[PDB]
Every structure is written in C-alpha cells, then in structure tokens.
Ligand binder design. Sequence first.
Ligand code: ZN
Lengths: 209, 79, 98
Amino acid sequence: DDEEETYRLWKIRKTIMQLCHDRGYLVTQDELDQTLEEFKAQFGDKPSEGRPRRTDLTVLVAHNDDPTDQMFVFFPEEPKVGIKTIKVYCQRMQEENITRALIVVQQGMTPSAKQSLVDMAPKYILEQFLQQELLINITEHELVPEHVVMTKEEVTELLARYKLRENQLPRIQAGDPVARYFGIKRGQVVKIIRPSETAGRYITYRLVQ
Amino acid sequence: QKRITTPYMTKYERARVLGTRALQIAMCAPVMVELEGETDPLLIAMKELKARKIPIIIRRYLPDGSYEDWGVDELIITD
Amino acid sequence: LRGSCLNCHMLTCPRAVIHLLLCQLRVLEVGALQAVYELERILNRFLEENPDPSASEIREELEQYTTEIVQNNLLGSQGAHVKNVCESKSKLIALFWK
Ligand SMILES: [Zn+2]
C-alpha cells in the first residue's frame, strides 16, 4: 500500500546508499542522510498509484578511483524475477559499458536466473539482494566488526610478514552476508578489525573462498 | 638476515638447554665453570647458564620451515 | 558396479561431472585451493554454450586452465596438506560418491 511501501523503499534506498559508499562509490552526505520526508519530496508518495516506480528508483553510482567503472542498482518490477528481466538489464548495461550491477528483488530469483547471474562473464558482474535483508544495514550491528578489503600489495606484505600461504589463512565464504555486502571476489583477503574486549582492537585476516 | 624473534630465552628453551648441557656433563664433557662441590649435572648446567658459558645454538624453527640461529650467549636470561 | 553400465562399461554419470571433478582433483594435488571454483565457473559457461562430446577427454578450456594451474604451481605439492585443501578434497570426493 502507501505509507508502508514508502517506508520500505526509503529504507532499502538508504541501505544501498550506505552499501555503495562502503564499497567506495561517490555518495553525498545529503543522499546518505535522506529523511523520509525528503524521500517523499524527491520521489513521489503513493507507490500503488505509481508516483515512485521501481523503474524510477534505479541509481547509478560511480567509483572514486575513476568514473569508468560505475555500477547500477536495479529495483525490478516483477516480484519473482526470471531470466527475461536480467537479459533486459544486461542489454541496458551493454549500451553504457557498465561492468557491474546489483539487483534488489522482493521475492527471490529463480535458480535458473541465479545460475544465469553467475554464468555471466567477467564482462558483467551481477549481484542479487533480497529486499528483506536490506531493511537494516547489518554492518552497523554491534557484533559485526569492520571489514576492509585489501589491495594485492597489502596481501603480499601480509603473506611476507608471516611467511604464509593463502591455503593457511582463515576463510570467509563468498555467500557470507558481509562478503556479499562489500561485494568481495573470491581470492581476496579481508582485513577485519575486531572490537575486542581483552585488547582494544584486533586485526585478523580471512580469505574469501 | 636480521633475526626478528624475541631477544629473551623462553622458558621452554632454558629447559632444553639445561637438559642437553646436563646430558653433556653426564658424559665427560669439560666443565667451563668451577665446581663448588656439586654432583648434580643440573646444578652445574645452571651455573654455566648463569655465567653465560654455554656454547649451544638454539635453532628457532618458524612454521614455514625457515629458522634462525641464536646462541645462548646472545639471549637474555631471567629468573 | 552400481553407477556404471555393465554392457559398455562406462560410468553412467553425465560427462561434465567426471571431467570437472577430474580437473578439480588434479588442481587440488598441487594445493591450488583457489581454482576449484574457477573450473566450475568455466564449465558452467561452457555448458551454457554447447553440450560436450564424451569422446574428447579435454574440454579445450578445462584442461588448458588446469595445465596452466598445475604447471604454475610446482612446489605446491608439499603445501597441499592444510585443513582447507583436505576439507575441499574430502567434500568433493564425498559429494561424488553420494
Ligand atoms: Zn552401456
């Protein structure tokens, strides 16, 4: 309806804005601190009437190293998403030479379309999120520590300080919720600052497998 | 290369240094210190550890297989 | 004897299962724990392209990548005894037999 779907769209917009900033994309402070009244000012209210369409909420953030790698965040219209929609999304990405997107479904995808999103090349990195798991940012929880993806120069000096192989380092799954939040490829090492109680902060490292 | 481990002798190292050196003095190895009437090789090995007169090298193996060599003369012994 | 034909004496698996698990085990001999998903990603797009022939053992992308990984990682045979390599090898063998 109204006044509940606007709240859900406001929260899952704010959460993907926080997600895109944490991955390192250009997001302003006003776009992070967007209140619900400012959301009803920018986009419409009454989504059942369709003043905010989920087509209208598709954002395009760009990365801070260079503006060549920018990322879509699609909010698809249909509740159950098949391959017919993601082919259209990949045809939109191939025009503007976009190499990465993020589909926020409201019920889950079909497993055929799941294997399709995996089955795209390094030319198209497509990710998927349920709407329900974007109602709160999980990285703001008190138990979730801070995760920092490491450059390949920091992984080299890591494995050189301890004289260590990547087979020996601890693991984090690639379907882990915080690895899916930060959008981490397999093979990358994630620096983790634990809010320890015996020490103040504790640096551990996990590899994405 | 530069030796990047602890300058102190750990408690597990002085046990095995005193064990190896007391086993040497259990054979007729020459005693570097003055025997003040001791008949126990552990007490003689403790006097040799205190006087910094043990020549054995501790080879501290790192878990990749690498090592680094320390004499007991260049480790800091405590009580 | 259960999961094989007794006339032609072949395994009645799909052939992609056999070639994928062969290449994954060849990679896990040299401890390259990274490539067991990379081989799966190669085979899924190769089967999205076209079905495979059984008479050719190589799939032109799996044996090539597997040869690159094994030739790249030569001193990784004595580093294949960690928990992650042993867990992944155990999981692949057990998932095949189940
Ligand atoms: Zn047969």
